[PDB]
Every structure is written in structure tokens, then in C-alpha cells.
Ligand binder design. Structure first.
Ligand SMILES: Nc1ncnc2c1ncn2[C@@H]1O[C@H](CO)[C@@H](O)[C@H]1O
Length: 370
């Protein structure tokens, strides 16, 4: 039949996040379209190029699916050596343009900005109900382009909220440097708790499962704090504290790239995905229950909890801790974005990214746009 290699960056499955999303798209293609999928996880960064070269060399795969930005460097080198080997790069796009490479990029600014508004609002409500100061936050993985877009969008969204509302909610963003270190994710979060961070956006793959656990042990100590999921809806992991999730439809990327090949309509080039296409979004009722169903039938849903009970609890907390102004502002930005009235800039260098943040920290929001 048709044969696909899914080639992870760092972690592999068990994410609850980025890669498990990617596998889901591949798993759906195996069953619906009848293809053979092989997964594979390099044990080092050093070896990525050799491994990518050997799989192309093998002639066994109609498509090689590359899950993560870190594949961009090795692919730029390998792709031209095997021009009849088809590749899908997920969450990144190659510097040059090849016929044998379909890139799937997301516009993370779009969804993170919506999240920024929400977290600023939840932190505002925490402060208003408690009288103690509550910051927004994020525990991030590696310092790389997609996370630049998250960062920019998240800060944008917080400042937007602040300006539209006369609040001065602060935001603390920490790169941990790894996507596969839950323990480091937890210690990072525990430090942040003691610097007043109370709302925690997870932008670090597996790493921010530790973040989730840090916010649980805080809630257990009586402290009012909340987490925000990314990639999949992760509310099911602990719904009392995981109030919402930014969605990134990596599964649709992978599934679309595999379908295209199955129907001989593959073609090289960039495919950009944001709110307009369904590629990004926020976690709603059905999406929450869907992933909860998955974890239920996976036996990794926590004790004494069903998919239906998970939804009831999240909706309960969104009634309690997200004001209507939060939603009004979400909707007012979501619509300025879809309409084209707003479009973010994709930072070229690290130096450009760094100065967009200086400007957003200064309340100059227009720096992030065109
Ligand atoms: N294994 C990984 N390799 C590269 N990037 C990742 C990985 N896991 C997560 N990410 C990035 O971090 C974000 C937050 O989990 C994801 O949307 C993705 O952009």
C-alpha cells in the first residue's frame, strides 16, 4: 500500500501535546486511508541528518513527515539530494523552495494573543477577588521561531487587554530550553509562583506537564492559580486548574499531507494555518470531551472522572473566572484577525523578535503588526 515515516524531533509520543497531536493525524490516516505508518525518534540532535538521509536513501517511504522546527536545518541539506522523495515539514518552512517539500507553518501569534487576553483577564479577576497580586506567565521550551510567535502573540494579547481595560497585568515568560523535561518544567513553575505568577500558559510540549503539576500542588496549598493547555485540549489532565487550551491542529497538517500523497495531489510549498482555516483555535465543549474520551479509553484519565464530568468542571470554572469583558475582547480580536484588518509580522532574526518584545513591553502594540 502507501508507506509513511513520521519522524519526531525531540520527544516522541507521550507529549499530551505537539507530537501526540501529530501521531493522531497519522493514526487517523492509517485507519481511514489504509496507509502504513512507522514512527521514529532520534536519540540525539547530532544524528538527525544521517537518519533523515538514510530513510530517504531507503526508498521505503512515499512520504517522510518531519515533526518539528529542528528538522528545518537538516532538511534544507537533504531534500535536494533526493528530489523524488516527498517530505512534509510540520511547524516549519524551509528557507528555499523545493518541489519535493510541503511546509506547514502556523501563525501562532493569532491563537496566543487570544490566550494572552484570557490570562490577563483571569489574573485581573484573581487580583480583584483576593486583593493579592497575580501575574500571567508562560513556561516555554526552546528558544526557536514558533515560540517567538507564541511569545509575541501572548504578550500582545496581555497588553491589548491592559490597554482596552486600564489594568497593568504583568507577564513573565521563561524559556526552559527543553521540550522533554517535566521536572525542569515543574521547578520553573514553582519559582514563578513565588514571583506572583498565577496564570500559567504551557508552551513547552512535555516540559509543561511539570508546569501543570506545579499548579496542582499550589491549588492543594489553597493558592488560586490556573494553567492553560497548548496543542491539544489538555483540560482532562486536571480540569479544576486547566481552564482552557490553545489548539494547534498538527493532526490535520499530518493527515492532509498524507491524504494529498494518497490521491497523487501532493505539491511543494508553504501552507500557512491560523484562525481563518481552523488551524488554530480555543478549546470548546466538544473538543474538550473528545480528548477526554481519548484519555478515558487510553486509561490515562485521572481516577473518578469521566469525559462528561471533565466538561462540567471546566465550564464551571470559566463561568467563575473569565469575565464577559474577557470574551468580548477575545471576540473583538478574533474578528479583527479573520477579517484581515490585523496581521502579525513573522520575525526574520532573533534580533527582530527581541525588539518586538521591547516595544510590546512598552505598550507599543503596532510593532507586532503591519
Ligand atoms: N518535540 C518538539 N520539537 C519541536 N517543537 C516542539 C516540540 N514539542 C512542542 N514543540 C513546540 O512547542 C509548542 C508548545 O508545546 C508546540 O506548539 C510546538 O511549536
Amino acid at each position: 500500500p502507501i508507506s509513511v515515516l513520521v519522524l519526531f524531533d525531540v520527544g516522541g509520543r507521550g507529549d499530551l501535546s505537539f507530537n501526540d497531536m501529530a501521531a493522531l493525524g497519522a493514526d487517523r490516516a492509517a485507519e481511514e486511508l489504509g496507509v502504513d505508518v512507522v514512527f521514529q525518534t532520534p536519540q540525539s540532535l547530532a544524528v538527525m541528518e544521517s537518519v533523515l538521509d538514510a530513510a530517504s536513501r531507503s526508498g521505503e517511504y512515499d512520504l517522510i513527515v518531519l515533526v518539528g522546527f529542528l528538522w528545518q536545518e537538516p532538511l534544507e541539506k537533504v531534500a535536494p539530494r533526493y528530489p523524488e522523495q516527498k517530505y512534509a515539514l510540520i511547524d516549519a518552512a524551509t528557507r528555499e523552495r523545493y518541489d519535493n517539500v510541503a511546509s506547514y507553518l502556523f501563525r501562532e501569534q493569532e491563537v496566543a494573543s487570544l490566550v494572552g487576553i484570557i490570562a490577563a483577564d483571569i489574573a485581573n479577576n484573581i487580583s480583584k477577588a483576593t486583593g493579592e497580586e497575580a501575574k500571567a506567565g508562560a513556561v516555554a521550551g526552546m528558544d526557536i521561531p514558533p515560540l517567538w510567535r507564541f511569545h509575541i502573540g501572548y504578550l500582545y494579547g496581555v497588553q491589548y487587554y491592559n490597554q482596552a481595560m486600564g489594568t497593568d497585568v504583568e507577564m513573565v515568560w521563561t524559556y526552559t530550553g527543553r521540550f522533554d523535561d517535566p521536572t525542569l518544567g515543574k521547578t520553573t513553575a514553582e519559582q514563578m509562583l513565588q514571583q506572583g505568577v498565577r496564570v500559567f500558559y504551557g508552551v513547552a510540549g512535555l516540559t509543561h506537564v511539570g508546569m501543570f503539576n506545579a499548579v496542582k500542588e499550589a491549588a492543594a496549598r489553597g493558592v488560586i492559580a490556573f494553567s492553560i493547555g497548548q496543542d491539544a485540549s489538555q483540560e482532562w489532565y486536571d480540569p479544576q486548574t486547566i481552564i482552557i487550551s490553545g489548539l494547534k491542529r498538527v493532526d490535520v497538517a499530518v493527515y492532509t499531507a498524507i491524504k494529498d500523497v494518497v490521491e497523487g495531489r501532493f505539491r511543494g510549498g508553504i501552507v500557512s494555518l491560523g484562525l481563518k482555516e481552523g488551524g488554530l483555535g480555543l478549546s470548546d465543549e466538544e473538543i474538550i470531551r473528545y480528548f477526554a474520551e481519548i484519555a478515558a479509553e487510553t486509561g490515562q484519565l485521572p481516577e473518578g472522572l469521566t469525559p462528561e464530568k471533565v466538561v462540567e468542571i471546566v465550564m464551571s470554572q470559566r463561568e467563575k473566572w473569565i469575565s464577559n469583558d474577557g470574551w468580548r475582547l477575545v471576540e473583538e480580536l478574533k474578528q479583527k484577525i479573520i477579517s484581515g484588518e490585523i496581521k502579525f509580522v513573522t520575525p526574520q532574526d532573533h534580533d527582530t523578535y527581541d525588539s518586538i518584545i521591547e516595544e510590546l513591553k512598552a505598550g507599543n502594540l503596532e510593532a507586532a503588526l503591519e
